[PDB]
Amino acid sequence: DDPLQQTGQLFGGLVRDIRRRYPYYLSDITDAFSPQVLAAVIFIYFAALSPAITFGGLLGEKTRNQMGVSELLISTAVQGILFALLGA
Amino acid sequence: ALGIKSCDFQAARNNEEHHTKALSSRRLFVRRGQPFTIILYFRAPVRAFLPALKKVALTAQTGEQPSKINRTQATFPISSLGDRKWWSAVVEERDAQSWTISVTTPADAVIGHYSLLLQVSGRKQLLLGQFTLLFNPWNREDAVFLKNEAQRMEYLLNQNGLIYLGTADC
Ligand SMILES: *[C@@H]1O[C@H](CO)[C@@H](O)[C@H](O)[C@H]1NC(C)=O
Numbered sequence: 001d002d003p004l005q006q007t008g009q010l011f012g013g014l015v016r017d018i019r020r021r022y023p024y025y026l027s028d029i030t031d032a033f034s035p036q037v038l039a040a041v042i043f044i045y046f047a048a049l050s051p052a053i054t055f056g057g058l059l060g061e062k063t064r065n066q067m068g069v070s071e072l073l074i075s076t077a078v079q080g081i082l083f084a085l086l087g088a
Numbered sequence: 089a090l091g092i093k094s095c096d097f098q099a100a101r102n103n104e105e106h107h108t109k110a111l112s113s114r115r116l117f118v119r120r121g122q123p124f125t126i127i128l129y130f131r132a133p134v135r136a137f138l139p140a141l142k143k144v145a146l147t148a149q150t151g152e153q154p155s156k157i158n159r160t161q162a163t164f165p166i167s168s169l170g171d172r173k174w175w176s177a178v179v180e181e182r183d184a185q186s187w188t189i190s191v192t193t194p195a196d197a198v199i200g201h202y203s204l205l206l207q208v209s210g211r212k213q214l215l216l217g218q219f220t221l222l223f224n225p226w227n228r229e230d231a232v233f234l235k236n237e238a239q240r241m242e243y244l245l246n247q248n249g250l251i252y253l254g255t256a257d258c
Contacts, residue, residue, distance in 0.1 A: 001210060001211050001212045019209060019210050020210045023089055023210075
């Protein structure tokens with residue numbers, strides 16, 4: 001099975017990928033009980049928070065404070081949870 | 089969640105029933121028009137049966153350039169009900185890890201070297217094995233069908249013959 005291929009059906013890639021991936025949902029749920037996952041979480045938390053604050057400060061000082069740090073943080077959280085739940 | 093470990097063509101079991109015991113004991117030679125039993129081995133036990141039965145099917149391929157217009161290619165699913173006069177396959181015995189399938193073959197098929205393939209709904213096709221198809225006088229629906237049994241023994245399964253020479257007197 002190829003993840004990428006031309007299919008003569010409209011939206012064929014979407015259905016092919018969902019049927020390829022989604023039966024692994026319980027496996028994805030169960031494989032996260034190791035402490036290495038906790039270490040990765042605590043690492044990536046800072047690794048993603050620091051560039052967020054830096055870019056938020058620069059962006060806020062650039063656009064006359066119309067959009068700032070809190071908006072960037074909440075947006076990052078929103079697509080993070082959404083992509084974690086519904087991502088391939 | 090489904091993975092096939094290996095397939096076992098029960099050659100030594102159905103080769104004597106197909107009268108091909110003298111031909112081989114490891115390779116699988118089958119006669120057309122007669123069902124034969126094979127065994128499939130899973131990697132993990134199946135949670136549900138019918139949903140797993142729905143999304144898997146198997147094909148038979150033969151010749152250099154197979155096609156459905158030359159009758160050199162066939163596709164059929166693993167179903168509990170179907171036409172017995174064409175290609176079909178029904179599960180006879182179910183285990184936690186293994187299935188026993190009974191494949192049926194049409195009484196009018198192209199002979200030659202065959203290959204069996206299995207297709208998963210998401211994953212690609214996988215080759216299970218190879219077998220050969222031959223005519224049989226034991227099938228009532230075949231063009232070559234011998235009513236007598238001793239005639240079958242003499243004219244098909246015998247290997248020691250006699251050739252008559254000399255004049256018409258001796
Ligand atoms: C908020 O926007 C108004 C309207 O342009 C502006 O006068 C004010 O300075 C802004 N506040 C900031 C940049 O803190």
